[PDB]
Amino acid sequence: KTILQSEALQKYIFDTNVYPREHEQLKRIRDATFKKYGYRAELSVPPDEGLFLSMLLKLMNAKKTLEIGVFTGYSLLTTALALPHDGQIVAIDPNREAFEVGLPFIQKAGVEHKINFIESDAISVLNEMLSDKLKMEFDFVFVDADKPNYINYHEQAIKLVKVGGVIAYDNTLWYGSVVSVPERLRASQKPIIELNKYLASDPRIEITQISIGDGVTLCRRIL
Amino acid sequence: KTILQSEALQKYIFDTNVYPREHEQLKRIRDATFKKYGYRAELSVPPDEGLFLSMLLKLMNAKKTLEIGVFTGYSLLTTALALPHDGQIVAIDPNREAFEVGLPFIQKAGVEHKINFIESDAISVLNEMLSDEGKLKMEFDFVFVDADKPNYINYHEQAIKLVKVGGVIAYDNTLWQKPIIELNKYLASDPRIEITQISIGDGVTLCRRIL
Ligand SMILES: Nc1ncnc2c1ncn2[C@@H]1O[C@H](CSCC[C@H](N)C(=O)O)[C@@H](O)[C@H]1O
Ligand SMILES: Nc1ncnc2c1ncn2[C@@H]1O[C@H](CSCC[C@H](N)C(=O)O)[C@@H](O)[C@H]1O
Ligand SMILES: [Mg+2]
């Protein structure tokens, strides 16, 4: 899986610059995820994107983060390992079963204490955060869930992220189809095109769309 | 050029997510670069990589940077615009004529005061910095290496002493040929850095100094 010019080039990146520095428990998540899910393992953040997100989190000095869409936990464990010892993550996914595929390796990595996993749909949780008593504020928000709700998440996340914080959207080049379409991915083409147009014109954010993985768009909140 | 599956996909990134947000003086650098250097305009850091570097510098809170390889100044102006008002950039290139193509637009953007442009080969400039004991602890937050590929490993061993612990050295063109193959192996096995290779532009490898 790649949006690059060649699968060989994608493998060069993995072999040269990811797998030799990949945490062993991240490898364990990858192996377990393919064994259970087959091609659906491609739902995971790819390992080169993971390593990038890790250094991004370190460079921003992020400590409080929100993850919408957990699956078996590759990006969640990536995030927990990058954060300092007192980092805290709110991680939302209706599929607790997938989460428990990765949880033994999260536990082995010693970072379970950083994670608040919420088995729920994200819309209601983020609406409760906005409606809750306390001040929810995040350094970083990773949106990697159900694409038809991405614009809805944006309007929630732009209230919950700090000014100067980052909201990151995954899959924003969607197999190249934003410019094309593989028939089974057609349903998600429109919502990603819609999200791309929405972020492109948003004055409250600075953006960079990065041709890593299946496309990552970073949104730095400035208003 | 693009390392993506299709040129249409690359152009989509530019049209949708770069040009509507691109500083007008960066556009003017792009146009003047084609007018003077033609298809060597391709040597410039591409617009999507520009916004990426800009976002990196803002998130890092970078203030002092070093640029090796300037050409007509697209990445240099990108950097100057991302830095705070009191930011400083040291920019090294033997081609002063190319720099002076972009200079009017750097000046119109109001950021010329941030820039110390040095007309030289970078190896000797950096060796002089390493010799300058008195300013050795005046370190850079960010180093961008975008020059002559056969010297990249040499620049690494200089830059790793010039950048702060926790700062970043960024190598351009790491998905290029031999000096890049060698560089990629060298950084992969360097215990003094953490790395991430990003498939943007011609390939960018970020090196965060940890020792
Ligand atoms: N309404 C919703 N709210 C939150 N998550 C949802 C959701 N609907 C679907 N999802 C979840 O979105 C996930 C997308 S895959 C997430 C991949 C993950 N970031 C990783 O690196 O492994 C799926 O696990 C799915 O269960
Ligand atoms: N020994 C050397 N030291 C510093 N720069 C060098 C060099 N040898 C070649 N170069 C320069 O490296 C540059 C590469 S093109 C640089 C692109 C620039 N960052 C931009 O965005 O426009 C050329 O301008 C060339 O003059
Ligand atoms: Mg993903």
Residue numbers in the entry:
A (entry chain A): 8 to 139, 142 to 189, 194 to 236
B (entry chain B): 8 to 183, 202 to 236
Quote the authors verbatim.
Here, we identify two O-methyltransferases from tea plant: CsFAOMT1 that has a specific O-methyltransferase activity on the 3ʹʹ-position of EGCG to generate EGCG3′′Me, and CsFAOMT2 that predominantly catalyzes the formation of EGCG4″Me. To explain the specificity of CsFAOMT1 and CsFAOMT2, we crystallized both in the presence of EGCG and S-adenosyl-L-homocysteine (SAH), a by-product of the cofactor SAM and determined the structures at a resolution of 2.0 Å for CsFAOMT1 and 2.0 Å for CsFAOMT2. The electron densities for SAH and Mg2+ are unambiguously assigned, but EGCG was not found in either structure. The structural overlap of the monomers of CsFAOMT1 and CsFAOMT2 revealed a root mean square deviation of 0.36 Å over the Cα atom of 190 aligned residues, with the most striking difference occurring in an α-helix (α9) near the substrate binding pocket.
CsFAOMT1 exhibits significant 3″-O-methyltransferase activity to convert EGCG to EGCG3″Me in a Mg2+-dependent manner. In CsFAOMT1, this α-helix is bent toward the pocket, creating a deep and narrow cleft for substrate binding, whereas in CsFAOMT2 the corresponding α-helix is bent in the opposite direction, resulting in a relatively open and shallow pocket. To clarify the exact roles of these residues in substrate binding, we replaced SAH with SAM and then docked EGCG in the structure of CsFAOMT1. EGCG is embedded in a narrow and deep cleft formed by two α-helices, α3, and the bent α-helix α9, with both the A-ring and B-ring anchored through hydrogen bonds. Briefly, Y46 from α3 interacts with the 7-OH on the A-ring. For the B-ring, K156 and two residues from α9, R197 and S201, recognize 3′-, 4′- and 5′-OH, respectively. Notably, both CsFAOMT1-Y184 and CsFAOMT1-Y184R could form a hydrogen bond with the carbonyl group on the galloyl moiety, thereby positioning the D-ring into the active site, which may account for the specificity of CsFAOMTs to the D-ring of EGCG. The difference is that CsFAOMT1-Y184 helps to locate the 3″-hydroxyl on the D-ring close to the methyl group on SAM; substituting the tyrosine with an arginine that contains a longer side chain pushes the D-ring into a deeper pocket, resulting in the replacement of 3″-hydroxyl group by 4″-hydroxyl group close to the methyl group on SAM. Furthermore, we found a hydrophilic residue E49 in CsFAOMT1 that is in the proximity of the 5″-OH of EGCG and might be involved in the recognition of it through water-mediated hydrogen bonds, explaining why only EGCG3″Me was generated by CsFAOMT1. The exchange of a single residue in CsFAOMT1 (Y184) with the corresponding residue in CsFAOMT2 (R184) appears to be sufficient to confer apparent 4″-methyltransferase activity on CsFAOMT1, although the activity is much lower than that of CsFAOMT2.
